[PDB]
């Protein structure tokens, strides 16, 4: 139901927000409270004593993390962000969510969807962070802590927290804690605002530059956003001119001449984009016109709203009254021809249907009811025949059926058969087959375009017929339309900005109505009337035909010339102007076919279009040579009413061209269609390119194709899975940009792994003609790629572990991180007593109290211990057995297994260091529940830290990673002269060199460096006024 709607309007867009809080999406999670308070420690070491907020609370574990929507206000949220949990908790279900085809587990999944899942994570955090920043407050400081600055103030409530927190700068106290000498690194001269804008007295800034606890990514993203947006702004003058030249030089809007401060309005884009979007519209409409009927009606409406046309039967009536006589004859041809009139009730409309058909011509043909036809031969003894036939004669130059005068002549042919006939060498069809039955010029004989093939007395009639036609069949011309910088162009069958017409245009000579009677239509009906005259001058139509009937039919056709309908010049001159002016007001730009007058040699035949290819051919020339999109449809209509319309001209006597248009257009110039269309379809094509780029991270293609993260388990699969991913994205999107269209249809149709947009047509002699687009820019792609590469080094920063692990007897007394490397006990595939494994399996037997063993791929004989290298995937064969074989043999048996997963999420488990025990339970569990698709996030058993030293204690642990990833740890135990126990971490130099380093520029980029979280931003003090408040709309 939304299809014509998609040709009617768009959903409400969202382009501007105003961040009434914070932009960056990160807070620290301090989760594990410290061992405090210790006793000989005086309470003098903390701030909860004299109560001013610390920028960071103290905790035994504290790490920076992303969190969306915890510090910011908006009048509008932006569609379902992503946040995670500490490494002590599991969000993993994501991975058992939205794509898995089989699941049962709470801890474990198919390694397949993995890359896809983190992909989704990426793109959704791409999604959420697009808000727009309203420049933020200020207020002069009053305690000499600061430089008395204008602190960035929140005009909303409860801002003192951030002051305390964003500014350990603002912090200062005699004490030596981590934070103390940490912040000692900062200076005081580069705080808060960097700069601003100011002019136009009685105002705030026009833009500002200030320092904020802030990332770089969202900054970069939304700035890119802002910029691409800004690529489309306008200034009054051109909008004024749009009005004007489209106002027919009559109605006014005036441009400002006063000082311009700032008036933002990003709308206008390049032409190719709207071209191709509407092109896709044209794609996904194949083979139905029930959609077209509404707009046809609407056209007739809006044109009826603008025309001084009146329809009148009375002319017909008084005219046909043309006889005075004594009555004994056989017939009254008066009432006969009247049979077409039916001497009002109730003619209202439907003259303009095929006329519109001219204006969207490129797609449909116009015809009339075969029911209107007398399908019954003819005889001059029946002038009903000639009446109807002439009705048809009228209709024909108003008909777009590609056989119009063909069928005209064909009537005649069907009539005088055996009295008069034409040349022919084919009986595929003969002269005795009717209309709606003869289409191609290759159905039209040589004689059909060769008047020489008959003697002009053997059949003078048809000879003069073809001759007349060749000399007089109506002549076409053309005209321009609209303004390109406000409307663009959809004309592709023709040089840009042209608009043909089956008719020749004739300008008028004065602003009044014009009394015009030399029209090729005037002359045209005159032609066919005299043709009838000459016809009936036959010697043979008077062995019983009367002088009375003679003068009757003479004066018949004569007064048929004597008609004074006011439509001919009407449509010949200024109705074209009605067309030109509706064109913009008309939604859904057109496509019309180029025309012939007599040509039968350049008619187009077919249309062929691709959205994708199946072969190694990429050159669109040879590519579309088999891909295709052809639709073709008739529209049957009336000949009676339309002929009448030709035959019924009556207009108001006070009608005058100029003033009528002047008044009429004026109300009729509120139009907002195009802007909404631009927004929607811009977003549309961007979705195209973004989506296919996503795909590109899954598949291979003749397209330039590369991927970098593939080491994450995921592989190609069916088109089913493909479109699965695809529509998941689409739904995320329609959420994100908040509209409710139908979209991606061509992409949700066949093979999306490859695309091609070539659009062509075939002619009377092949000679096809085609077009393909080049895309505009697409920042979101750049963004998401950059992010993929960000996380290409910041995985663990999100609980994401690369590398692998090793299960082994870890029995010692020294305290050191399982995520640290062994002081002395590293193991891999290069040690003695290491073994890698094929499917070699032969278990020995310990009965006979003998030496039990297992057979190596070597072929040796092996007990259960050593340094071994195994594909856990094999463990998942009959893991029941597997576990049963080695549970104890690893428990206190001393085998060592370097083992592979590649990548995963993990799990944390803290505990008192001041005691000892074993970690065998989750050992057993996390082992046993392996399936080919069950894999709990890797557990980890680490004690908890302190401030000082102790005597040591026993320790028994099992497994270690392969690579370092403890970056995620941000810091621990702030209010401390140091963290002694465990390791110690510190607020990384990698985060605030803005002030710690005095030599950094105002801007700097940490790529792929561990990024900052305090950053300078330019907050936008722009204002984007509405499109009507500036423009003075005046008659």
């Amino acid at each position: 139901n939304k299809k014509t709607a998609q040709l009617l309007h768009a959903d409400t867009p969202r382009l501007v927000t105003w961040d009434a809080g914070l932009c960056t999406s990160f807070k620290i999670v301090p989760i594990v409270p410290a061992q405090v308070p210790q006793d000989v420690l005086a309470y003098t070491f903390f701030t909860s004593s004299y109560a001013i907020q610390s920028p960071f609370p103290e905790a035994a574990v504290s790490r920076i993390v992303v969190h969306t929507r915890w510090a910011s206000n908006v009048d509008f949220d932006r569609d379902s962000s992503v946040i995670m949990a500490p490494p002590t908790e599991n969000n993993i279900h994501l991975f058992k969510q939205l794509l898995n085809t089989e699941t049962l587990s709470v801890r474990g999944a198919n390694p397949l969807m993995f890359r896809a899942n983190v992909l989704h994570m990426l793109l959704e955090f791409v999604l959420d962070n697009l808000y727009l920043n309203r420049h933020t407050g200020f207020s002069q400081d009053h305690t000499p802590f600061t430089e008395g600055a204008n602190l960035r103030s929140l005009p909303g409530p409860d801002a003192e927290k951030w002051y305390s927190i964003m500014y350990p700068t603002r912090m200062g106290t005699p004490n030596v804690s981590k934070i103390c000498n940490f912040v000692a690194s900062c200076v005081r001269n580069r705080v808060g605002r960097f700069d601003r804008a100011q002019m136009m007295n009685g105002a705030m800034s026009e833009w500002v530059d200030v320092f904020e606890t802030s990332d770089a990514l969202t900054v970069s993203i939304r700035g890119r956003w802002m910029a691409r947006l800004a690529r489309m702004n306008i200034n009054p003058t051109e909008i004024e001119w749009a009005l004007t030249e489209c106002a027919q030089g009559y109605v006014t809007v005036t441009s400002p001449y006063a000082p311009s401060v700032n008036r933002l309005m990003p709308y206008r884009i390049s032409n190719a984009e709207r071209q191709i979007s509407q092109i896709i519209r044209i794609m996904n409409i194949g083979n139905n016109a029930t959609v077209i009927q509404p707009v046809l009606q609407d056209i007739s409406v809006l044109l009826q709203r603008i025309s001084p046309l009146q329809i009148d039967p009375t002319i017909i009536s008084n005219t046909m009254s043309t006889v005075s006589e004594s009555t004994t004859q056989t017939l009254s041809p008066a009432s006969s021809i009247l049979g077409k009139l039916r001497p009002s009730n109730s003619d209202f409309s439907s003259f303009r249907v095929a006329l519109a058909g001219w204006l969207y011509n490129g797609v449909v043909t116009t015809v009339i009811d075969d029911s209107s036809y007398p399908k019954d031969g003819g005889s001059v003894t029946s002038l009903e025949n000639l009446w109807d036939f002439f009705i048809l004669a009228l209709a024909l130059p108003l008909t777009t059926d590609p056989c119009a005068p063909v069928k005209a002549f064909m009537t005649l042919a069907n009539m005088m058969v055996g009295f008069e006939t034409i040349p022919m060498d084919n009986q595929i069809y003969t002269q005795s087959r009717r209309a709606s039955a003869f289409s191609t010029p290759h159905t039209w004989p040589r004689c059909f375009m060769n008047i020489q093939l008959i003697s002009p007395i053997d059949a003078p009639i048809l000879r003069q017929w073809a001759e007349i036609i060749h000399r007089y069949w109506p002549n076409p011309s053309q005209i321009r339309y609209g303004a390109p910088n406000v409307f663009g162009s959809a004309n592709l069958f023709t040089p840009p900005e042209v608009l043909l017409l089956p008719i020749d245009h004739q300008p008028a000579n004065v602003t009044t109505p014009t009394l015009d009677f030399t029209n090729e239509l005037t002359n045209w009906r005159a032609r066919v009337c005299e043709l009838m005259k000459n016809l009936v001058d036959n010697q043979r139509y008077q062995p019983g035909w009367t002088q009375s009937l003679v003068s009757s039919m003479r004066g018949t056709l004569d007064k048929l010339k004597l008609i004074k309908s006011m439509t001919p010049m009407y449509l010949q001159q200024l109705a074209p102007v009605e067309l030109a002016v509706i064109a913009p007001m008309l939604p859904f730009p057109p496509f019309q076919v180029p025309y012939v007058r007599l040509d039968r040699d350049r008619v187009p035949t077919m249309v062929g279009v691709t959205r994708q290819s199946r072969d190694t051919i990429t050159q669109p020339a040879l590519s579309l040579s088999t891909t295709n999109t052809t639709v073709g449809v008739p529209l049957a209509l009336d000949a009676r009413a339309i002929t009448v319309a030709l035959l019924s001209g009556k207009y108001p006597p006070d009608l005058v061209t100029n003033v009528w248009y002047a008044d009429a257009i004026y109300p009729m110039y509120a139009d907002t269609e195009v802007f909404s269309n631009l927004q929607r379809d811009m977003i549309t094509c961007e979705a195209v390119q973004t989506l296919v780029t996503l795909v590109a991270q899954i598949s291979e293609t003749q397209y330039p194709v590369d991927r970098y993260l593939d080491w994450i388990p995921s592989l190609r699969a069916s088109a089913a899975t493909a479109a699965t991913f695809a529509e998941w994205v689409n739904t995320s999107m329609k959420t994100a940009f908040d509209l409710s269209d139908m979209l991606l249809e061509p992409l949700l149709s066949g093979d999306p792994r490859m695309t091609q947009l070539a659009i062509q047509y075939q002619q009377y002699n092949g000679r096809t003609f085609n077009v393909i687009p080049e895309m505009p820019g697409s920042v979101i792609a750049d963004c998401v790629q950059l992010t993929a590469e960000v996380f290409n080094h910041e995985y663990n920063l999100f609980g994401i572990a690369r590398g692998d692990i090793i299960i082994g007897r870890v029995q010692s007394t020294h305290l050191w991180s399982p995520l640290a490397p062994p002081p002395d006990l590293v193991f891999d595939r290069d040690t003695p007593g290491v073994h890698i494994f094929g499917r070699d399996c032969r278990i020995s037997f310990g009965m006979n109290g003998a030496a039990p063993m297992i057979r190596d791929e070597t072929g040796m004989m092996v007990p259960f211990e050593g340094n071994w290298i195994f594909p856990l995937a094999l463990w998942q064969m009959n893991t029941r057995y597997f576990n049963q074989q080695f549970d104890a043999w690893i428990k206190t048996g001393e085998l060592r297994i370097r083992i592979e997963m590649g990548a995963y999420p993990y799990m944390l488990h803290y505990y008192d260091p001041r005691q000892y025990a074993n970690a065998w339970n989750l050992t057993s569990a996390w082992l046993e529940e392996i399936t080919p698709t069950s894999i709990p996030s890797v557990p980890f058993m680490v004690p908890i830290s302190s401030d000082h030293d102790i005597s040591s204690a026993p320790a028994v642990q099992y497994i270690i990673s392969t690579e370092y990833n403890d970056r995620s740890l941000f810091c621990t135990n702030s209010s401390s002269p140091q963290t002694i126990a465990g390791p110690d971490k510190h607020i990384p130099v990698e985060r605030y060199n803005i002030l710690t380093n005095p030599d950094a520029p105002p801007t700097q980029i940490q790529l792929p460096e561990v990024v900052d979280l305090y950053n300078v931003v330019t907050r936008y003090a722009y204002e984007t006024p509405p499109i009507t408040a500036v423009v003075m709309g005046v008659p």
Partner: protein, 214 residues
């Protein structure tokens, strides 16, 4: 442009102007449909022929050249067209080439159609040139000075050397009689049955001759 964009450069008093044709073509001159574009072209061709007939150190035309070469339209039909052929011949006769059959003052309608019949055939051009809307060439030293006055659409290949001697005629007419000729041999050889098989598609045999008197 697809309705025919042709121009004669050499200045009329008409002045700067271009031209398009309409959607009509001549049925007459059996057996040809005739799109007036190429028709008026043929007329220009006749002009150039008439030109090439004589050669006098004062042939007081005002313009040797009046024909029209494609200003626009080269984007709908290739070089194998009859029309491209015509324009070739246009610039050729512009050089000064001329038919190798006696030429009527007015060359019959059917003369024209027969001409068409001929040229339309298979074969090649004698003239390598292929002109351009990018530019139209100036011959080696063809005796005409229209180049000597204009640039607009004109670039000579100074490299050009493909020329001929000079020759024309003072009388061209007809005779009925099958008249004499004498052979003047050459040097090389050939193969016999092969010449037989050659003539096997050329003979006038078989026919009854006028036996005449013995």
């Amino acid at each position: 442009s697809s309705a025919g964009v042709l121009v004669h450069y050499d200045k009329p008093t008409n002045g700067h102007h271009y031209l398009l044709g309409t959607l009509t073509q001549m049925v007459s001159a059996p057996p040809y449909i005739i799109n007036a574009t190429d028709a008026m072209l043929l007329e220009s061709c006749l002009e150039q022929f008439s030109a090439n007939v004589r050669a006098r150190p004062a042939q007081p035309v005002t313009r040797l050249d009046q024909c029209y070469h494609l200003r626009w339209g080269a984007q709908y039909v290739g070089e194998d067209s009859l029309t491209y052929r015509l324009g070739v011949l246009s610039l050729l006769a512009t050089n000064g080439y001329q038919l190798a059959r006696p030429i009527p003052r007015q060359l019959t309608n059917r003369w024209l159609s027969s001409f068409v019949s001929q040229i339309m055939s298979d074969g090649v051009n004698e003239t390598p040139l292929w002109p351009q809307e990018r530019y139209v060439q100036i011959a080696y030293d063809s005796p005409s000075v229209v180049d000597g006055a204009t640039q607009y659409g004109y670039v000579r290949k100074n490299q050009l050397r493909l020329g001929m001697r000079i020759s024309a005629l003072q009388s061209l007419s007809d005779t009925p009689s099958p008249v004499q000729w004498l052979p003047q041999y050459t040097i090389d050889q050939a193969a016999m049955d092969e010449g037989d098989l050659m003539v096997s598609r050329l003979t006038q045999l078989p026919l009854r001759p006028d036996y005449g008197n013995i």
